[PDB]
Amino acid sequence: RAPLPPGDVERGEKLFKGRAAQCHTATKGGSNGVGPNLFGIVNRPSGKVEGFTYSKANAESGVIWTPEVLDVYLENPKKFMPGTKMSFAGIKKPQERADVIAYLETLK
Numbered sequence: 327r328a329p330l331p332p333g334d335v336e337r338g339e340k341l342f343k344g345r346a347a348q349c350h351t352a353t354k355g356g357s358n359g360v361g362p363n364l365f366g367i368v369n370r371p372s373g374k375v376e377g378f379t380y381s382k383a384n385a386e387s388g389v390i391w392t393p394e395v396l397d398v399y400l401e402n403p404k405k406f407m408p409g410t411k412m413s414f415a416g417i418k419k420p421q422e423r424a425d426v427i428a429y430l431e432t433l434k
């Protein structure tokens with residue numbers, strides 16, 4: 327597996343608005359919806375967003391969302407975590423994936 331290329335936060339923001347925002351808010355204290363609020367998610371344990379009802383798979387995943395883990399997971403969520411109720415096919419293109427992860431890193 328080759329490394330992701332370098333990301334861009336602005337390209338990543340646009341991709342977040344277009345793809346993650348269908349189910350995810352990004353602001354601190356932003357609301358839960360289809361999916362949990364994602365503020366502060368990078369390098370944090372999975373399944374901890376207050377008020378969100380996770381599947382047992384995500385609730386007990388135990389994974390820590392490092393950029394490297396987000397790389398593999400966001401490429402194909404269901405393959406990485408069978409049982410996830412995150413119904414997203416993934417970000418297949420490495421550059422787009424890198425950009426989204428760079429943006430997530432800015433979510434303080």
Ligand code: HEM
Binds near residue numbers: 345426
């Ligand atoms: C670029 C797009 C997306 C990104 C970066 C993203 C990111 C994430 C991350 C990091 C988690 C784990 C959160 C945690 O463990 O606290 C998650 C969970 C989740 N996401 Fe997404 N997501 C994206 C798109 C979507 C879409 C399109 C949907 C719905 C159609 C969705 C719905 C969900 C749901 C329901 C969960 C909880 C899953 C479970 O409990 O098993 N996400 N997402």
